[PDB]
Amino acid sequence: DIVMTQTTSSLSASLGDRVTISCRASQDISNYLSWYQQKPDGTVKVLIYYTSKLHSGVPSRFSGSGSGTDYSLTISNLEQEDIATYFCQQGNTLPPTFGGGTKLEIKRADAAPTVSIFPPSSEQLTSGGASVVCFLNNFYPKDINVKWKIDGSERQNGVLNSWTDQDSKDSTYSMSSTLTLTKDEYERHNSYTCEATHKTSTSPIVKSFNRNE
Amino acid sequence: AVQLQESGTVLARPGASVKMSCKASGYTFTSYWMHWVKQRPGQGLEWIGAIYPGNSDTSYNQKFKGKAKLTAVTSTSTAYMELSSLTNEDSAVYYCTRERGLYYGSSSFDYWGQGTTLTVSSAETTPPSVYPLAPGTSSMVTLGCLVKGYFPEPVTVTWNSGSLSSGVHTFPAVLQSDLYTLSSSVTVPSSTWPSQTVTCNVAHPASSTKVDKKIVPR
Numbered sequence: 001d002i003v004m005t006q007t008t009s010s011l012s013a014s015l016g017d018r019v020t021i022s023c024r025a026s027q028d029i030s031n032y033l034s035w036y037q038q039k040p041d042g043t044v045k046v047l048i049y050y051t052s053k054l055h056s057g058v059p060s061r062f063s064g065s066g067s068g069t070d071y072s073l074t075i076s077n078l079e080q081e082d083i084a085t086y087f088c089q090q091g092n093t094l095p096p097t098f099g100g101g102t103k104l105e106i107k108r109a110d111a112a113p114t115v116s117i118f119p120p121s122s123e124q125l126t127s128g129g130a131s132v133v134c135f136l137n138n139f140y141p142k143d144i145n146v147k148w149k150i151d152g153s154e155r156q157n158g159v160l161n162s163w164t165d166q167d168s169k170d171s172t173y174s175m176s177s178t179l180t181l182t183k184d185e186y187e188r189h190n191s192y193t194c195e196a197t198h199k200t201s202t203s204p205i206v207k208s209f210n211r212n213e
Numbered sequence: 214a215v216q217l218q219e220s221g222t223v224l225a226r227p228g229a230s231v232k233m234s235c236k237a238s239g240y241t242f243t244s245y246w247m248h249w250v251k252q253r254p255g256q257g258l259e260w261i262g263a264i265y266p267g268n269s270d271t272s273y274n275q276k277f278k279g280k281a282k283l284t285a286v287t288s289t290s291t292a293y294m295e296l297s298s299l300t301n302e303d304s305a306v307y308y309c310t311r312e313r314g315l316y317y318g319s320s321s322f323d324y325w326g327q328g329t330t331l332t333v334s335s336a337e338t339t340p341p342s343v344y345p346l347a348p349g350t351s352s353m354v355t356l357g358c359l360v361k362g363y364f365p366e367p368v369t370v371t372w373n374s375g376s377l378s379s380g381v382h383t384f385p386a387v388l389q390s391d392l393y394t395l396s397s398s399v400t401v402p403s404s405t406w407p408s409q410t411v412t413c414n415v416a417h418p419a420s421s422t423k424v425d426k427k428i429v430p431r
């Protein structure tokens with residue numbers, strides 16, 4: 001069908017920083033384009049139809065521009081409420097197709113995470129389970145690589161990672177990794193480490209612990 | 214003015230069929246093209262079909278032909294969607310949205326619903342097993358509470374009746390062998406605790422499971 005394509009997937013901008021999204025159609029669409037906004041809280045509304053026609057009841061900071069294939073949408077002045085995933089769509093032929101989406105984010109200074117490792121509590125350790133947790137709170141570029149080197153040995157089978165969206169308070173990310181084992185395996189290795197390789201400083205922040213201690 | 218009210222979160226087993234719902238209000242329901250959409254996380258939006266309530270004539274998509282089925286009742290001012298022969302690929306969140314242009318239509322949509330989430334798996338309502346997280350003391354310290362082995366979502370997490378609300382990070386739930394699992398963090402200075410009470414309050418209305426938990430080191 002008609003393949004829409006946005007130039008990116010995630011962006012970076014601060015308050016007032018005039019910025020733009022650029023959609024691209026597989027072919028001509030005769031200026032039958034529309035822009036949409038989807039808050040991470042599920043809701044979704046429209047901004048523009050027909051490349052640059054404002055819907056009844058939207059601010060003049062938004063606008064539009066379009067021709068043939070290369071289309072775009074700009075906000076000459078940003079506000080906190082304008083952070084969301086932004087979609088586009090062609091109204092030329094069937095089936096109606098959308099862009100892959102473009103999420104927004106505030107760009108701020110790099111920051112190392114506040115790591116905190118946690119051995120498996122006793123309440124768990126008697127239930128046969130053996131879960132080792134590692135929190136990584138308040139950090140920037142989401143692009144983190146985490147690894148667990150038990151007795152100094154790379155391992156993946158057992159880990160389950162979780163990521164939070166951009167914090168509405170100070171715009172910083174957090175990660176919650178958690179390695180799961182059975183008691184028998186836990187009771188055969190000693191040194192457990194939660195290594196958090198990050199961009200900020202070459203030094204991998206390590207939070208280790210020995211079960212003999 | 215105008216509003217679309219999609220049904221709440223719903224789930225069912227694979228192979229079976231589900232009936233969604235999208236109620237309308239504030240405009241002439243009969244004379245407007247109502248559309249549906251499918252949003253999966255990794256990808257964008259996938260057009261699934263549309264309908265004109267007056268005659269209830271349909272326009273599906275080649276990919277979803279025979280898969281979904283659209284209906285529409287006039288008196289209830291409600292739009293419907295029914296999926297069948299389900300698989301994990303259908304596990305997603307669906308939307309309902311109005312096409313502007315009164316009788317003839319147009320090139321755009323104007324108003325949307327809050328979206329209906331759909332999950333599928335062979336599993337049963339299970340309550341979690343809340344476990345405590347303590348280190349083993351610092352200046353500034355982080356604690357937390359871990360849940361595990363519960364179904365279905367969601368699950369609420371508080372800290373002493375929600376008295377706390379700073380430096381908190383309740384992480385979204387992940388999945389292992391068809392069961393949910395998450396965690397949560399709390400932030401305080403070295404003083405506050407263990408010198409003072411610090412408990413995490415959990416709630417899983419599905420299993421009707423209320424649990425409080427004061428955490429202690431070793």
Ligand SMILES: C=C[C@H]1CN2CC[C@H]1C[C@H]2[C@H](O)c1ccnc2ccc(OC)cc12
Pocket residue numbers: 090091092093094095096246248263264272312317318319320321322
């Ligand atoms: C099932 C759809 C019907 C509703 N509108 C009138 C007749 C049918 C077509 C569509 C519109 O003309 C239209 C034509 C071509 N391409 C379109 C692409 C998107 C779109 O927005 C719903 C409407 C389009």
